[PDB]
Each structure stands twice: as structure tokens, then as C-alpha cells.
Amino acid sequence: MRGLSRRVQAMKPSATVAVNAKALELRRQGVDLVALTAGEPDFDTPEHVKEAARRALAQGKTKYAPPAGIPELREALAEKFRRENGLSVTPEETIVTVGGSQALFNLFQAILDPGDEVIVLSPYWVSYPEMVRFAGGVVVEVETLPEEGFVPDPERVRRAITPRTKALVVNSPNNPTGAVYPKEVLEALARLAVEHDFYLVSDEIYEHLLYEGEHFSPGRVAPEHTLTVNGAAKAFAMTGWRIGYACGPKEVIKAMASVSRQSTTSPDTIAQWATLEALTNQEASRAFVEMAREAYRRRRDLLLEGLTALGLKAVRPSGAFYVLMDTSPIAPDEVRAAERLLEAGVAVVPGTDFAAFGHVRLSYATSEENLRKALERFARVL
Amino acid sequence: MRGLSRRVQAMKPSATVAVNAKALELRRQGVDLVALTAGEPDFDTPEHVKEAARRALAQGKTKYAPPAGIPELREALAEKFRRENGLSVTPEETIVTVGGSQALFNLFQAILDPGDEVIVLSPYWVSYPEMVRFAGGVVVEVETLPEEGFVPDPERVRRAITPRTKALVVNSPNNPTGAVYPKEVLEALARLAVEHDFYLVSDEIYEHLLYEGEHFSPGRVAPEHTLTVNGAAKAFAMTGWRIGYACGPKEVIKAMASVSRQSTTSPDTIAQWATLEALTNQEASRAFVEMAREAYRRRRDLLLEGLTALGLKAVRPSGAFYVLMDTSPIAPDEVRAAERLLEAGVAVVPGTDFAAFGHVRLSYATSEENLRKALERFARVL
Numbered sequence: 001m002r003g004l005s006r007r008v009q010a011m012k013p014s015a016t017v018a019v020n021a022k023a024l025e026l027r028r029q030g031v032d033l034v035a036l037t038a039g040e041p042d043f044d045t046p047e048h049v050k051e052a053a054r055r056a057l058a059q060g061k062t063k064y065a066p067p068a069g070i071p072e073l074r075e076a077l078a079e080k081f082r083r084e085n086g087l088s089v090t091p092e093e094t095i096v097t098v099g100g101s102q103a104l105f106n107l108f109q110a111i112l113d114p115g116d117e118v119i120v121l122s123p124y125w126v127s128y129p130e131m132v133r134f135a136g137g138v139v140v141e142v143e144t145l146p147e148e149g150f151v152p153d154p155e156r157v158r159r160a161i162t163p164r165t166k167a168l169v170v171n172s173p174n175n176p177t178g179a180v181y182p183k184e185v186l187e188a189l190a191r192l193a194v195e196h197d198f199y200l201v202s203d204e205i206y207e208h209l210l211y212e213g214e215h216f217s218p219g220r221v222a223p224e225h226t227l228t229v230n231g232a233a234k235a236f237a238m239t240g241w242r243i244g245y246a247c248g249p250k251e252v253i254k255a256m257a258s259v260s261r262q263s264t265t266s267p268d269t270i271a272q273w274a275t276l277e278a279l280t281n282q283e284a285s286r287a288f289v290e291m292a293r294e295a296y297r298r299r300r301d302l303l304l305e306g307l308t309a310l311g312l313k314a315v316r317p318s319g320a321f322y323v324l325m326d327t328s329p330i331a332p333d334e335v336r337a338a339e340r341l342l343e344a345g346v347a348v349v350p351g352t353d354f355a356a357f358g359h360v361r362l363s364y365a366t367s368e369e370n371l372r373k374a375l376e377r378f379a380r381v382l
Numbered sequence: 383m384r385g386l387s388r389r390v391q392a393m394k395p396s397a398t399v400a401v402n403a404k405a406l407e408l409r410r411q412g413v414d415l416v417a418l419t420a421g422e423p424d425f426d427t428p429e430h431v432k433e434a435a436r437r438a439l440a441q442g443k444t445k446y447a448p449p450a451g452i453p454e455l456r457e458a459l460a461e462k463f464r465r466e467n468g469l470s471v472t473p474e475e476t477i478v479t480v481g482g483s484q485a486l487f488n489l490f491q492a493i494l495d496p497g498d499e500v501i502v503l504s505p506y507w508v509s510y511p512e513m514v515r516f517a518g519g520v521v522v523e524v525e526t527l528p529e530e531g532f533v534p535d536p537e538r539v540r541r542a543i544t545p546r547t548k549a550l551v552v553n554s555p556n557n558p559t560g561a562v563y564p565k566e567v568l569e570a571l572a573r574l575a576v577e578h579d580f581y582l583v584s585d586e587i588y589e590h591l592l593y594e595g596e597h598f599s600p601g602r603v604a605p606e607h608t609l610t611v612n613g614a615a616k617a618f619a620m621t622g623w624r625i626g627y628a629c630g631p632k633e634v635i636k637a638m639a640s641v642s643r644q645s646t647t648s649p650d651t652i653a654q655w656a657t658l659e660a661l662t663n664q665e666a667s668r669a670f671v672e673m674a675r676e677a678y679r680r681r682r683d684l685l686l687e688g689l690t691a692l693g694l695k696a697v698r699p700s701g702a703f704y705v706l707m708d709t710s711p712i713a714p715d716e717v718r719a720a721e722r723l724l725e726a727g728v729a730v731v732p733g734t735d736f737a738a739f740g741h742v743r744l745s746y747a748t749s750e751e752n753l754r755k756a757l758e759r760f761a762r763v764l
């Protein structure tokens with residue numbers, strides 16, 4: 001018999017896609033659109049990393065790499081997690097993947113049996129429920145509130161724990177809210193995992209894009225229950241290179257490497273050598289991160305002041321490069337709100353797919369010049 | 383609760399891994415081993431491809447690409463499948479993946495429900511059965527015979543079809559036997575798929591590593607039943623670049639792109655632009671394929687002559703860069719034979735994991751000097 005599997009037919013349809021299509025006709029008819037939709041840095045990847053790629057090419061490093069990643073990168077990763085995050089991990093508890101997205105995918109494929117439950121905190125990054133469902137798991141949503149700065153209340157989370165809970169996904173700094181979770185909240189979540197015996201999946205890819213507070217890694221207190229996911233994408237403007245990394249309990253990391261062996265074999269060899277440079281040349285990487293961080297902070301402050309002057313509400317974000325804006329004054333729901341803004345000349349992402357109803361995600365990984373135009377046009381819509 | 387999933391615990395062990403252990407300990411305790419284990423070209427990737435990569439780097443092509451691949455590459459792929467293989471496909475029935483291995487992985491995830499059967503022809507590439515079982519499939523094995531040049535008998539295959547058969551996997555040229563299947567057997571196989579309504583998966587990565595005969599793509603006789611898997615890995619010495627591709631029915635391709643979107647997002651952008659060059663610079667790309675093919679043919683003939691002279695039996699291969707050698711004169715079984723050879727100073731791959739019992743896979747993707755060194759050491763295990 002022919003016909004698709006059930007797992008692939010069970011995939012839900014994005015509101016983002018449909019607003020994006022209308023964005024493309026507008027452009028076809030010559031309409032100038034200001035896009036605040038980016039999920040990646042506007043900066044190009046730093047030259048020290050590009051140069052490392054050039055050396056790897058010239059040195060013929062174009063052959064297959066081990067499934068868990070080249071050993072030198074695994075060693076550098078053990079250093080980075082300890083030095084930057086206070087995580088006590090060995091090179092064998094580290095894995096290189098095809099983007100942080102594959103670390104998450106492999107992780108779920110490795111720990112979920114059909115019916116296993118995963119608590120996700122909304123608003124959430126679009127891929128989490130998807131990856132959980134694709135592996136036969138059940139998504140259990142716990143909401144975080146705008147009045148609470150979108151920071152989870154451990155009390156609301158306790159209520160979602162059942163005997164089938166396998167994992168809890170935490171993402172700080174958060175996409176799409178921009179919230180940075182206080183260390184006390186993270187310690188509280190790590191304690192629930194230990195007390196109830198489940199895994200804590202900590203998605204820390206925005207660790208370096210922080211404006212205020214401190215980035216705390218829950219693996220500091222519960223290393224045997226925590227799977228730390230990270231990568232080079234957001235920090236070093238390496239989204240198109242597809243290199244992510246994770247660390248955690250030895251047996252789970254080994255399983256994750258087995259999944260890679262049967263799927264992608266190993267991430268691109270040239271990209272692994274380029275990432276090694278990003279991790280070992282701390283001086284040049286630090287310079288890049290500080291430059292981007294200052295640029296982002298300026299842009300964020302510029303945006304928030306403008307929204308506030310318009311009377312528009314957004315919880316102030318402390319990290320990442322996103323702002324969740326309430327759309328109530330623009331339309332009855334967020335898709336209608338996004339279509340209206342499109343007509344005004346501004347492309348934003350509807351909050352539907354993230355479970356951020358009545359909101360729209362704005363991204364400030366653009367130039368100030370573009371943020372000024374966008375504010376001018378919101379003005380018109382009001 | 384914590385713990386690994388059944389799908390991940392289900393994967394069984396490898397005899398390859400165990401002998402590579404012994405081989406590593408000898409490499410360790412001062413031993414000189416000639417390795418005939420390579421599953422990749424010894425040649426480095428051609429300069430024009432490397433030059434395309436540098437250009438993309440210089441141009442800032444380091445951002446997220448669409449899940450099915452950059453549009454320029456999907457189009458070039460359509461030209462390649464239409465021109466080289468006589469396949470009639472649109473760029474939309476085309477997909478770029480992280481190695482041909484991901485194309486196969488995404489394919490099985492997209493078409494198999496737990497219990498669905500997949501027919502594989504032994505000796506087979508080690509990953510086929512792994513990928514099928516990981517998606518919940520049941521592996522149904524149909525043996526090809528040495529006496530028959532490892533070419534399948536359609537009747538034996540026909541005898542394996544049940545109402546649960548979802549696909550049949552065919553790999554020509556073949557890894558590990560080196561057999562190239564005749565157009566007529568390929569047509570007979572396609573016919574069964576059309577006649578019994580199931581998918582025909584054709585792994586054609588070695589198409590350009592052909593010494594005698596002609597490459598036939600069965601997607602030509604059953605376009606709506608065939609998924610053609612290929613990639614730049616073996617043909618352009620780009621194994622470490624992780625770029626594969628497939629074409630076939632639109633609805634299946636679209637489902638494979640959805641699996642990518644939730645796992646790897648898209649393959650590395652730099653590698654996609656470099657592959658476009660391998661595809662469109664036909665003059666430089668053919669010069670390389672022709673240079674490699676010549677070299678392989680020389681090495682094959684030299685290896686075959688040498689074996690014959692030693693009184694060792696092997697079926698003469700027409701494609702790829704492998705030879706399956708009968709180990710009867712060496713040891714009771716292939717693992718034992720591989721261990722004796724290790725002692726004699728030669729590393730080979732036991733046939734065990736490919737279901738090639740009583741055989742050992744030799745690879746001639748090394749220099750003639752190394753092949754000569756190996757033949758010399760073979761004298762010691764008679």
C-alpha cells in the first residue's frame with residue numbers, strides 16, 4: 001500500500017505561513033514592507049569563524065566525522081559548559097548536532113515512548129509541541145502570564161506533573177517572550193524534576209543575548225536530570241551553518257548520538273572546524289558578542305519607547321531579540337491584527353503558533369532605520 | 383520518570399565496532415595496519431566546489447535556507463534528474479537533505495507506520511534495517527546470491543510481498559557487493575511495486591562509480607511509485623559536506639520536507655551553494671568523475687588480479703569501490719577471518735552487519751601502493 005505515515009499526517013498548519021504568503025503578494029505588487037519577522041541575527045558570521053572554515057577547506061577536512069562530533073570540538077564544548085555555565089561535564093557528555101533543532105529532535109526520539117508527557121510553557125517556540133508529538137508524546141501546556149513577565153510560576157507547573165511526565169522544557173532567554181528567568185525560579189524547576197524524577201530540558205541558545213540579569217543553567221544543581229541544549233546559531237550569527245550542541249547524562253547523550261548515526265551521520269565537517277574556532281578564540285568571539293549585544297540593546301530601547309508612546313503594550317524583554325506586543329487595540333485577534341499591519345506596510349509574526357494569542361512577535365534583529373519606519377506605520381494604523 | 387525510549391534501546395550491536403576496537407588497540411600498541419575499510423573516496427573534494435564554498439562565505443550566505451533546500455539547488459536537481467537519469471521531475475518533486483542518509487531516514491519516517499513491512503535485499507548497507515525499525519517498520523529480507531552475481535531474482539522478491547509491504551529498497555550500484563543491476567531486473571522490480579501497490583526506494587548514490595554496464599533509474603517505469611535517493615557524497619568526494627537529494631511523488635517529498643523542518647531545519651547553506659556548483663559546472667565536475675572512475679578501475683583490477691593469484695574468491699564488481707571476499711579459506715566465520723587479517727596487518731570490514739556472512743568487505747578507495755601492501759600481507763593468512 002502507498003500513503004503517508006500517521007505521524008506525518010498529524011502535523012498542524014501554521015498561521016505564520018498563511019500571513020507570509022499574503023506578504024509575498026504585497027511585495028509582488030511592489031509594496032514596500034518593513035519586516036520585523038526575523039528569527040536570526042542581521043549581522044554576518046564573524047571573520048575568525050569564516051577564516052577557520054577557509055583553513056579547513058584548504059586542509060582537506062572534508063571527510064566524515066564521528067556521529068557525536070569531532071573529538072576536538074567535544075573537548076572544547078566540555079570547556080565551554082564548565083567555564084561559561086558552571087556545568088560539570090566531561091567530553092563524553094557532550095554532542096554536536098545539525099543545529100540546536102536536531103539536539104532537541106534527537107533528545108525526544110531518545111527519551112519518549114508513545115503516551116509519555118512533556119510539559120511545555122506557553123508562549124513556546126513553535127517546534128517544541130511538534131517534536132514532542134512526532135515522537136508519540138503528549139504535550140501538557142502550562143501557561144505563563146504577561147502580568148508575571150511571562151516567568152513561570154512553579155506552582156502552576158506542579159499542577160501539570162503526573163505519573164507519565166517524562167520531561168519539562170524550559171527556554172531562558174525565551175523565544176518569543178524575551179523573558180530571562182531568575183535563578184530562583186530555575187532552581188525551583190530543577191527541584192521538581194528531582195523530586196518527581198523527570199528530565200529538565202534547558203534550551204539556552206540565547207544565553208549571550210542578555211541585557212539584564214544573569215543567565216543561570218539548571219544543570220548546575222541537577223546534572224543527572226538536566227539536558228542542556230545550546231548552539232552557535234544565535235550567539236555567533238551562524239544560523240545557516242547548522243551546528244548545535246548539548247550536554248547531559250552520559251546515557252542520554254550516547255542515545256542521541258545513535259539517532260544521529262541512523263539519520264544525519266554527523267554534522268558538516270567544515271562547520272565543526274569553524275565552530276571550534278568560535279569556542280577556542282574567546283577573545284574574538286567575545287568581541288563579536290559584545291558588539292551585537294550593545295546593538296541589540298539600543299534597538300530594543302528604541303522600540304519599547306516608541307511602542308509606549310503609541311500606547312501599545314509589550315512586556316519589556318531581558319534577552320533574545322524579540323518583543324511580544326498586545327494587538328487588542330489593532331484588531332480582535334492576532335491574525336486579523338497581522339493582516340492589518342501588513343496592509344500598513346509592516347510584516348510581523350502572529351502569536352498563534354506560539355500559543356501567544358492576542359499578541360504578535362516583533363523582532364529587532366534589523367536596523368534602527370527599519371525600526372523607525374515600522375513605528376511610523378504603527379502610528380498610522382492608530 | 384526518567385529513562386530511554388524503546389526505539390533507542392531496540393538498536394542492536396555491530397561486529398564492525400567490535401573489530402575496530404581490536405584494530406585500535408593494535409594501532410595503539412605500535413602496529414602498522416593497512417586499512418581497506420573506507421566507505422568514502424580517498425580523493426579530496428574538487429577545487430571548483432571548494433571555490434564555490436569560499437564565494438558563498440565571502441557573500442554572506444550564512445542564513446537559514448528553506449526546509450527543502452535553496453530554490454537554485456532544487457531547480458538544478460530537476461535538471462540533473464531529467465538530464466542524467468531520464469526522470470521527469472519538477473523542482474517541487476525535489477528535496478535537499480543532510481546526506482543521502484537523511485533522505486532515507488526522512489522517507490521512512492514519512493511513509494511507515496508501526497507494522498508496515500519493508501523488503502531489503504541482502505547483502506545490504508548497514509543503515510537500511512536500522513532506519514526501517516526506528517520508524518516502527520518490520521524488516522523482510524530477500525537474499526541475493528554470489529552464484530547470481532548478487533543480482534536479485536524478481537521471483538524471490540515476489541515471494542516476499544504481503545498485504546503489509548509498504549516499500550522495497552534497491553541499491554545499484556551496490557554497497558557492499560559492487561553489483562550493478564541490469565535494466566531488465568530494475569524494470570521487473572518496478573513492475574512489482576506498481577502491480578502490488580507499494581513504494582520503490584532506489585538508492586542511486588554510486589551511479590557515477592560504474593565500470594561496466596549502464597545506470598538505470600527505475601523511477602522511469604514507475605514515477606508515482608518511486609523515490610530516487612542520491613547525493614554528492616560519493617561522486618564528488620563530498621562525504622563530510624552532508625548534502626544528499628531525492629525526488630519522487632510530490633506528496634511524499636512535501637512530507638519529507640516537513641520532517642526536516644522539525645528536525646534539522648535545512649542543510650548547511652554554504653554546502654548547498656557548493657553543491658549547486660558541482661551540479662552546474664559540468665565540465666569541471668565530469669573531469670573529476672572521469673579522473674576518479676579511471677583510478678578506481680585501475681585499483682579494482684589490481685586487487686582482483688592479486689586475489690585471484692592468492693586463490694581467494696570474490697565476485698567481480700562493476701560499480702562503487704567495494705569487493706566482497708569469500709573468507710572460507712581464512713577462518714570458520716567472517717569475524718574470525720577479520721581478526722586473523724588484523725594480526726596479519728590488514729584492517730577489513732566483517733560482512734556480518736550487511737548480512738554478508740562468510741565474507742569480508744574490502745574497499746579500494748585507497749592508493750595502489752596500499753593495495754599492494756595489503757595483498758602482500760594476505761600471504762600470511764593462508
Ligand SMILES: *Cc1c(COP(=O)(O)O)cnc(C)c1O
Nearest residue numbers: 099100101125175205231233244
Ligand atoms: C534558534 C533556536 C534554537 C536552535 O536553532 P538552530 O538554528 O537549529 O541551532 C532552539 N531553540 C530556540 C528557542 C531557538 O530560537
Ligand SMILES: *Cc1c(COP(=O)(O)O)cnc(C)c1O
Nearest residue numbers: 481482483507557587613615626
Ligand atoms: C554513502 C551511501 C549513502 C549516502 O551517504 P551520505 O554520506 O549520507 O550522502 C547512501 N547509500 C549507500 C549505499 C551509501 O554507501
